[PDB]
Amino acid sequence: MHFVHMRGLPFQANAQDIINFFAPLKPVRITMEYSSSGKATGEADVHFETHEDAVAAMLKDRSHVHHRYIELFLNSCPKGK
């Protein structure tokens, strides 16, 4: 329903780094991607309680996690409903 896709996270980043990234917005669920070799890709799905929280979270676009800038993509209530 209401999630933000992340791209470009540092390899060493944890779910708590994702939580601090969107703070004070509190994700309800975090999903992290791993490659065929079991290594993190830097991509993650962050689920929010409401559409408004997922929309607010988008202001964090191009902000950083350590040295890496993060690319965000909104997956919440599209205009082609």
Curated annotation (Swiss-Prot):
Residues 2-81 form the RRM domain. It comes from the Eukaryota. Depletion of GRSF1 by siRNA results in a combined OXPHOS assembly defect, with the prominent loss of complexes I, III, IV, and V. It also leads to altered steady-state levels of mitochondrial rRNAs and mRNAs. Monomer. Found in a complex with DDX28, DHX30, FASTKD2 and FASTKD5. Interacts with the mitochondrial RNase P complex subunit TRMT10C/MRPP1. Interacts with the 2 components of the mitochondrial degradosome complex, PNPT1 and SUPV3L1, in an RNA-dependent manner. Regulator of post-transcriptional mitochondrial gene expression, required for assembly of the mitochondrial ribosome and for recruitment of mRNA and lncRNA. Binds RNAs containing the 14 base G-rich element. Preferentially binds RNAs transcribed from three contiguous genes on the light strand of mtDNA, the ND6 mRNA, and the long non-coding RNAs for MT-CYB and MT-ND5, each of which contains multiple consensus binding sequences. Involved in the degradosome-mediated decay of non-coding mitochondrial transcripts (MT-ncRNA) and tRNA-like molecules. The RRM domains mediate RNA-binding. This is G-rich sequence factor 1. It comes from Homo sapiens. The lineage of its organism: Eukaryota, Metazoa, Chordata, Craniata, Vertebrata. The chain holds residues 400 to 480 of 480 of the full protein.
